[PDB]
Swiss-Prot record:
Regulatory subunit of the ATP-dependent BRF-1 and BRF-5 ISWI chromatin remodeling complexes, which form ordered nucleosome arrays on chromatin and facilitate access to DNA during DNA-templated processes such as DNA replication, transcription, and repair. Both complexes regulate the spacing of nucleosomes along the chromatin and have the ability to slide mononucleosomes to the center of a DNA template. The BRF-1 ISWI chromatin remodeling complex has a lower ATP hydrolysis rate than the BRF-5 ISWI chromatin remodeling complex. It comes from the Eukaryota. Component of the BRF-1 ISWI chromatin remodeling complex, at least composed of SMARCA1 and BAZ2B, which regulates the spacing of histone octamers on the DNA template to facilitate access to DNA. Within the BRF-1 ISWI chromatin remodeling complex interacts with SMARCA1; the interaction is direct. Component of the BRF-5 ISWI chromatin remodeling complex, at least composed of SMARCA5/SNF2H and BAZ2B, which regulates the spacing of histone octamers on the DNA template to facilitate access to DNA. This is Bromodomain adjacent to zinc finger domain protein 2B. It is found in: Nucleus. The chain holds residues 2054 to 2166 of 2168 of the full protein. Residues 9-113 form the Bromo domain. The lineage of its organism: Eukaryota, Metazoa, Chordata, Craniata, Vertebrata. It comes from Homo sapiens (Human). Expressed at varying levels in several tissues, whereas a smaller transcript was expressed specifically in testis.
């Protein structure tokens, strides 16, 4: 509350560390469904169904330009990429399985880097 604060967690390295995690997600062999925005002209249904599209290149541009106020807003966009994938793709599909694999990969890196 006013003039009453928990001890200051060092967040000075968060930008660099999120960039590194994102690099590792970008270079994973199963990243290919997630590297670029889904083409809304060529994928029937996507625009109407997926209210907030998100992809690794869009996260990279937001990160690089100071559009994430903190490390949690960054994690919410990464998780959005996978929630969107689950919304549109059957579990038993190459893209469906890619999504599950990448979310697992992300969550471990996230825990190991920050928890």
């Amino acid at each position: 509350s006013m003039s009453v604060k928990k001890p200051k967690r060092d967040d000075s390295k968060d930008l660099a560390l999120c960039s590194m995690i994102l690099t590792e997600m970008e270079t994973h062999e199963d990243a290919w469904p997630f590297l670029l925005p889904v083409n809304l002209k060529l994928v029937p249904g996507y625009k109407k169904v997926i209210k907030k599209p998100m992809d690794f290149s869009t996260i990279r541009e937001k990160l690089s330009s100071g559009q994430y106020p903190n490390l949690e807003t960054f994690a919410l966009d990464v998780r959005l990429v996978f929630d969107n994938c689950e919304t549109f793709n059957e579990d038993d599909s190459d893209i469906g399985r890619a999504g599950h694999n990448m979310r697992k990969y992300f969550e471990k890196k996230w825990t190991d880097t920050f928890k």
